Amino acid sequence: SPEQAMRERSELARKGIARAKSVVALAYAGGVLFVAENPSRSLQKISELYDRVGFAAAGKFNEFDNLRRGGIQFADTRGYAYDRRDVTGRQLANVYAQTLGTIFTEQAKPYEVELCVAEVAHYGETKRPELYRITYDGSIADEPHFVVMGGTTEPIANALKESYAENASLTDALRIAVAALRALGVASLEVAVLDANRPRRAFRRITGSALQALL
Template sequence: MTLPYYASAEQIMRDRSELARKGIARGRSVIALSYADGVLFVAENPSKALHKISELYDRLGFAAVGKYNEFESLRRSGIMHADMRGYSYDRRDVTGRALANAYAQTLGSIFTDQPKPFEVEICVAEVGRAGSDEAAQLYRITYDGSIVDEPQFVVMGGNTEPILTALRSSYRPGLSLEDAVGVAVRALQQPLGNDATPRNLGRGELEVAVLEQARPRRAFRRISGAALEALLPAGTVDGAEPDAPATGTGGTDPDGPASGSEAAPGQSSD
């Protein structure tokens, strides 16, 4: 008689955590940071059609890394949750904390109950009403349902250590939009792995959006084209990276590996 394979609960959870962390770290990074007028999102994303940054509700924004199909389903469910709550009660009752808690419960349940966890990490950002002195809120929710309130900035996906080091040395509260974009882009351009040469990311490789507190109702606004080019730090090349083919097609997967290695079909991560 063959004995069934046994693995302790601790080993199962450890294996799930390792799977999720590897999937999240395989791709390109996203930065969310507070600046003088709200919250700035900057993502390394060559795709024109598949977004890693989006609006959730009037004053709420969403950013994610990992499996595109998984975080896209979370984004859609978050929008539905926010719409239903705003319709049933009041639009002011839709808060970033409530939505972050809902995401944490969903991801925690999937991590515990399902055979495979979601390979995603998400950020929910919120700005106060126009004219108020409420500080912006940034919530990081990880693959296992853990939730952290970040006071200044969030870095997700890819090789986060050099990006975090760059942000800690250059970020300061109350940055203007132009300065905040410069800080975020320079952090994303940090060398990958053992490569000592900083990368050069033009507007063709970046997805940028803001939550502007001064806007009367819908705070979310995308920044692209000439408006983005005017905000990029000096020396940034427009378009694709010098040593890589242009990625102007709309079908580019935002979850493609940052290291250049090919992922299995349907398994790409960012």
């Protein structure tokens, strides 16, 4: 009776992901903005995969750490195989979905993680940012505006669907993100941005005095 087994595994994964912090990613005029509740200064829930691809997750650290390492390995191998301009976020999202789907069925314990992949345009080009969502069972979905994962999501989604204005600024988008997450000072916050005005590498972290002034 695979019905009971799949129901139990889905319940286990849902209960594992439910008791976790929330991560919010949204797109502004300069790219994508990642904000997470990370009191620890040594463990990071937001990172980069390639020159234009970003990584974000919520759940158990030892799982999405391995997922991030595998994604970085795949991106580097693919970039060296053909070219640096032939790497797209869709290829990484598909690999993540396949890996999670394989883990869910065969492995005794499923992964209690939620993944999001974001990409931006290259230098001197105009393109809308792309956001993808990958769940524990391997489902992949496309989100045009924002992705909310971790803990409860309905109130946060309803708060974000109200004050979200397209083509906003960094300070304004940060204010909306903090207000939505609150419903938090320099501490207990991790902020990263994918800047589309950079020559090659678009990922950079904002902490300390710059984060204090912006917030």
